[PDB]
Amino acid sequence: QWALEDFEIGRPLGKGKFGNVYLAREKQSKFILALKVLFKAQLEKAGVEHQLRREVEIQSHLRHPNILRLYGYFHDATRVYLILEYAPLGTVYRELQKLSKFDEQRTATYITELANALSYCHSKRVIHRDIKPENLLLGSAGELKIADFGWSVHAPSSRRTTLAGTLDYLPPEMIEGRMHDEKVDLWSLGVLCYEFLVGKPPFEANTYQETYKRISRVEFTFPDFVTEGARDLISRLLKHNPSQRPMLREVLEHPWITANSSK
Template sequence: MAIAQTNSQQQEKVSSEASAGEKKRWTLSDFDIGKPLGRGKFGHVYLAREKRSNHIVALKVLFKSQLQQSQVEHQLRREVEIQSHLRHPNILRLYGYFYDQKRVYLILEYAAKGELYKELQKCKYFSERRAATYVASLARALIYCHGKHVIHRDIKPENLLIGAQGELKIADFGWSVHTFNRRRTMCGTLDYLPPEMGMWLTIETK
């Protein structure tokens, strides 16, 4: 199924509808489903078009049975609550969610160029200018998060996406927390854990 590009005005329309919250009850019939974009432990991500606005989104489909089996329902609720309230050009938007008997659907901003990790694999290395731009964008997004008392706790190239204009966006807030206190939780991805976590030192940011 061919899916056309949309403009910023259409994006604002979907965003305003999603923020209406109680007024809008999303269902799968509100979307045209396109090609698969990826898959994870609990489900799949598809390119989709919201029919009313023609806005392109990424639709993340999670299976309830797998969420329950892994006992991460509370983690998903926390992810939705946190990410849906974040507004920053370098943070992937979560427009809304809905569910049926077997699945939970997250309506996410579409980052056209995919994962930073895959882009790095393709390019082998980034120029100093490009790398510096990504680092600066990431730093601004993290400063914003920490100002909102949100800690991501799983920053890695696989969780950084690239938008159509080459802009970096933090995604996947599954390990994130909203807290006013210091944390000692061992979490995240083993390959990217900083030394202080391995030594059980108090951390405030990740």
């Protein structure tokens, strides 16, 4: 069993809902890692222990270059610790903050890496349901890695009804609390592709009520600089009917993607 004494601790890397994520190093191997801390009292008050249970059992199962590794876990009197792969280049969120918008090459490359990661997830009947920029991390070579599986589920036989995720990235069936499946991640992929190119997600409004309505009615428009190929991909992903959204194979082979991705 791991314990805190197995690790050297460094600076906070980021801030989570239930605690910070810290730079860490395994003492024997000097291997650099991240330690995600969750305070037990806060978890218990919020009553979301099942999210942590799902996060651990699902993410420790996954082995893919574009999915953040979870190596192990432990706890003490007051805290739960998740031992994670360290992502040195930070979040896609921060990168978008600094660049305002991504060019088509960078965007298509990220979408390729996301589609590969999601293809692997969906083959194991895992749905992520929260793939927003602050949960997309960057490896040492700037490769995208999906992280934060606290909203994920293993759904091999039945559809889900949980109210989950983050409004701006959610499809109509999820915000309306209807039955949903792996196609929710395809909708979020469309939101991301738009946000990467434009700098803001497509259904952004000043009020949550208005954003909710815009999502439900698929109300968004394209700025003039978004190209024909990008419009085609995004419009196909942001379909109200989940079954009309493309397979991930279709995303990976889309002409705008293959023309622009460096991967």
